[PDB]
Design a protein around this nucleic acid. Sequence first.
RNA 1: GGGGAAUCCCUUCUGCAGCACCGUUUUAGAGCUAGAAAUAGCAAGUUAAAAUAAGGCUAGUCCGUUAUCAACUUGAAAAAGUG
DNA 2: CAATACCGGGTCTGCAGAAGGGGCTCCG
DNA 3: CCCGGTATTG
Length: 1331
Amino acid sequence: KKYSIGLAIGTNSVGWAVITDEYKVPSKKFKVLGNTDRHSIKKNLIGALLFDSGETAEATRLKRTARRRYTRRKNRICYLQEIFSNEMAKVDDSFFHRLEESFLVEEDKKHERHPIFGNIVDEVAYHEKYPTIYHLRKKLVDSTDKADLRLIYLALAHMIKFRGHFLIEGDLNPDNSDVDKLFIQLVQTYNQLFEENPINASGVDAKAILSARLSKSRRLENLIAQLPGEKKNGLFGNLIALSLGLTPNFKSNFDLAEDAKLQLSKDTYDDDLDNLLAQIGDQYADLFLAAKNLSDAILLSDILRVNTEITKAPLSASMIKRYDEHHQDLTLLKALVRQQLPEKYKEIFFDQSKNGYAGYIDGGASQEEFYKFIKPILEKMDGTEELLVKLNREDLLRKQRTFDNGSIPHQIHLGELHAILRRQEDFYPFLKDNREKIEKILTFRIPYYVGPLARGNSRFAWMTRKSEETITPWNFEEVVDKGASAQSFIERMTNFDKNLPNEKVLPKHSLLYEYFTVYNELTKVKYVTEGMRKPAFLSGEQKKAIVDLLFKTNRKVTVKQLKEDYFKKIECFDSVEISGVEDRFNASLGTYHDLLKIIKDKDFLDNEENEDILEDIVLTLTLFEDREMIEERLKTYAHLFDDKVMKQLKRRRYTGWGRLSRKLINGIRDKQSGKTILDFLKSDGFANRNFMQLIHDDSLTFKEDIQKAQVSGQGDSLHEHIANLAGSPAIKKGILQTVKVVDELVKVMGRHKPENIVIEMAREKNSRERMKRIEEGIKELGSQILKEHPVENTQLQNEKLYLYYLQNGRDMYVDQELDINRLSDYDVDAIVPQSFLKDDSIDNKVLTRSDKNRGKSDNVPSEEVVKKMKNYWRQLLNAKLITQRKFDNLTKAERGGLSELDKAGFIKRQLVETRQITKHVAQILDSRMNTKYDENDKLIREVKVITLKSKLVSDFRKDFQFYKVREINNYHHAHDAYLNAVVGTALIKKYPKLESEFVYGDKATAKYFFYSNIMNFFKTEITKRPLIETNGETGEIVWDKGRDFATVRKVLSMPQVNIVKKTEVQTGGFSKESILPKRNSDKLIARKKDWDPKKYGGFDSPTVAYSVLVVAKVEKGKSKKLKSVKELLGITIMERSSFEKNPIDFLEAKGYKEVKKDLIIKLPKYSLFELENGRKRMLASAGELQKGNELALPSKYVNFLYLASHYEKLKGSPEDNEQKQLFVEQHKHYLDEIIEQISEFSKRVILADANLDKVLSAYNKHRDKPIREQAENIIHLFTLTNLGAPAAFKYFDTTIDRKRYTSTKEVLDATLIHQSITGLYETRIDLSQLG
RNA sequence: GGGGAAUCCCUUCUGCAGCACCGUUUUAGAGCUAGAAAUAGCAAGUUAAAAUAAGGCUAGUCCGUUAUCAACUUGAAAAAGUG
DNA sequence: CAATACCGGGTCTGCAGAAGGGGCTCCG
DNA sequence: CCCGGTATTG
Ligand SMILES: [K+]
Ligand SMILES: [K+]
Ligand SMILES: [K+]
Ligand SMILES: [K+]
Ligand SMILES: [K+]
Ligand SMILES: [K+]
Ligand SMILES: [K+]
Ligand SMILES: [K+]
Ligand SMILES: [K+]
Ligand SMILES: [K+]
Ligand SMILES: [Mg+2]
Ligand SMILES: [Mg+2]
């Protein structure tokens, strides 16, 4: 009884099949449990588990951190109120109480309904004096009068509750506020540097031009237009562009011949500038510093739209300017509409359902929707010119709380808050005492490297405390151990050295690590000259001289430099051939040069006695992000450097960690030699052993010490091991389900393990990332293509338009512009032709006018194209509009193009699976099946695990006409698993040598020919072979081209396949999140315990975690007469814990009396019920059902539908295509037959009378359509019959809306079916017998 | 052939922490005039408070949406067993 | 109860890791 | 997107 298993692992299915050595699927009588009259049932050993996708933890995390934010914001307000408590109680002992109950209806309020002053006269007067809170804030900042303590509170609380972002470090410099003054500063600095060509900036209103609500490039154009003799690409123009936030290239200004682009926003700018100043000189540093200051002022002027010399509240003044312009323009608009369009006034100003002013203020119309609505109304009237300008500036009738206030820094709000505190502390002493406390409430921020301020009950926290006491914003530095916490943040996540598992890894930018990388690469360099017999390694002295002369004088070392500045200069070689390195060295001493620029003491860096110190310094710079903490840690070294050097040091920062520890690189020593790994890399006689050789050499202690260093740990469980794999959670859910399926199948075969297990794994918002990429790329390029052709993210899902923007509107193979309106006439071409690499991503595609201009089609684009286009391609690459892989493949021709080795490798890659995750699946199954060791203590591999790629079975299907149509039913998953088992077992029976390629555990033209013809033994004629294929050595039959194909056909024709939908409890959010207005409906759910939804609104649409079958009695009528019921009650996610804690009490609270506790049945989503005539339903919820049957369409119809619809591609030969076409035409009647099938099924099982009649009518309407189109729309038709939830579909232009099953009553008397994972073991419960 | 390691350039995905801005909901921001009222005419509108999973105990400036789940028997449970 | 229709909260900064092309020096 | 909740209309 030998058998194999085939598995098809996906993100929503695991297909499975059992085969015998004859490639047949067995069938068994399985026992049926329960209370029906059926005791057993015949099952085929083939099927597929279906499940909803496993989800990532991201949404859960976003909601978790948002929860924390709400908690802490409330705590800020609570701190402020605790500071105000006593004095407020003297002024008004219920102010804070009225604030707390402001949400309650007057009936529920325990105090006066007017929050601020508690009487209507004073409240109305307040709102009249201060129509916005920004009025009050400006008044309290500017006035010198004693203010009412309640108004002071409201201003401070408003600033603290909505406090602005923390994107900018430090204080908001008052020097860099004025645009005019900083523009003059930049001009003065430039004219200092360029006395012969000064700039005349008098009469230039720099403020108006540079702060105008316009695009960066337009403002640059305007300013340059105010300067005759100066162009926007000259030096001053580039400085202005850098100030405005563009990415100017200073290459041409300073004649660099190598690009020097600068963007103040990028993280690398600080180095980029220091990279430019290195080539230009340090006299230009003040010029770029002036540019940065001007940039800060322009950024501020974006938010502060008012003069900062009439008020210390420019932000509140700008909000008040919004309010005043809103008022004036609304008065004008009302007057103009009343005069010119009186009939539209009611709609514009009263109808909240429309997107006019009423919908804008009272309805749900956004600012953008209101603009779009009212723009034509302004265009049709006269006197609306300035209003239209404001609308196009997005500056018309604005509110003050708006989507763009995210631009406001917290330093602005802090300025206003501090000003108020300074005004009013002269009258309230508790404000003087607590001023810094209140400022700290605004400014204090839990660092991202500290985490939740927990006390042992958070699986997320890592913060440690210096003293056990409550943490507040004011004692945080004293109570939280910031250093230990920031260190734990990183060290919970960084790797240990795999060779020394108790050793932490070195910083990536450590001096020792970079020395290691440089010497490890340098020991394998070889050189040869004329008088040398063979190439020679570099000696220790030569390597040391190369490091001291080249690596310690240049950031990068090229082969050319090696030849000229070392071999010529030192060794007196005029010609030398180098091997082991190409073009330039990969490793380099970048940290050495950074630190040499900072400390300016080469002798310090070269003195080994400072190694420790330098290591620690880099450690600090890597471990911490906060510059104050960095300075604290570096303090011990302050006596070694000047204070300017210390400031430069603490401004330097690094990130990233290496792969090896310090103890491995330069700690452990070979016993005999006394040398470390790095010692050997610096000098190792004439063997020049590199790292791998060193740790694998039996004549050194390194291997032995690495072996001893391995430590034991607690082995993960199966679920733990699967969760810790690298991959999407969806594929991991599939992986675990696969293991459980295999366990059940082995149990089904009497605990006999299979001979083979063949596994195949499936291959695998968005427009937002596409838009992001195109925006950043065009910005880096400096192109105007988005100005001339604006595009929304959705449109970028079109392949050709996306490619058009990625290529900056140009042909990729020809130096010409493309025309947008002509995309349909252009071609999308594969860089590496798809006949070698099946890659259809953007990474292997380009848009070109005509693909013929690539060159020959049998290779990579020609060398001529590369010569033409390489510089444009490099510009695209630096703009991130193409990747390094795309650039390398486009330019491969100059490197020889595609070789025969490359093509053979491409074919092998197409056939042999090499993904790490599939290898991990194979290892899991192999270690579970094979557990015994032989006399040599090697594993006994009694079960062979074979991995296949989908292409093998796909090609098998297409070659032998075992076609698949995914839409017909779910059987194709199971058929895939079956064909996987067949092909894999036959393949390794035919070529056992292939086991290394395909079984887990253990000339170019020739291999190309071989792997391209590996599946020919199935065929009868090629491009002829015997009818019986055998193994050449064992002589055993592997394939019989008579019976075995008929066996496969019989398997695929079997109507009884075990499709099982995994029943799952539902988890997640309680309900829809929308907070609905109050309504007289029991559907509403209170958002807080006492917030009666009929008064306060609430949620609806809760999610049912699972249903429950209740047999009980319910009171009926006014008399409350008990009546027996049997019904389905949906337990919601929110109710689940309460129901499970005590079900009887819960059901009695819901109204059920005398519950039959032992008759309660838990019914998760997709619980299966069978009714009459084989009709099946699945539970969608407590009140809705899903389709429960599979339509087993016969195989001839499936193949006719595949051929008639042109499913996939025809391929083959024209004669075979003609035979397929003649088959389609000879079996046209199949169409009607297929329809009949559907109809029959729909009448037995679906019961959608109206939809079925509409479908039959639509089919009889398009009987004159081409056979191909009728076949495609018949493919569409199977949505009516598919398993699962009903869904709308389209037959030609007719739309069929889904017929839903809006009642679950019938299943309460049907047969409930409990299924095991394979569906082979069943328990059937007749529910009509309950009650 | 298979498996593995460091470096370089890129790319994708996964996990975690810390912020901001809005949105929504109820209340507050005295609507006026005529008319008995039904209604009509006009005025007005930009702001705020509070909640933002119900909530929980472990009471922290913590936790509350990921993963995992046929049924039956034995078991508090974990888990084991059952064709 | 049937047919039908509408609806659904959203976007940053920072850190660490695995793994996929392309290359290169090595190991078992 | 999808598909289960809800209301409307009957
Ligand atoms: K009251
Ligand atoms: K000019
Ligand atoms: K609105
Ligand atoms: K190189
Ligand atoms: K750092
Ligand atoms: K010093
Ligand atoms: K779940
Ligand atoms: K889910
Ligand atoms: K590698
Ligand atoms: K099940
Ligand atoms: Mg809360
Ligand atoms: Mg709001």
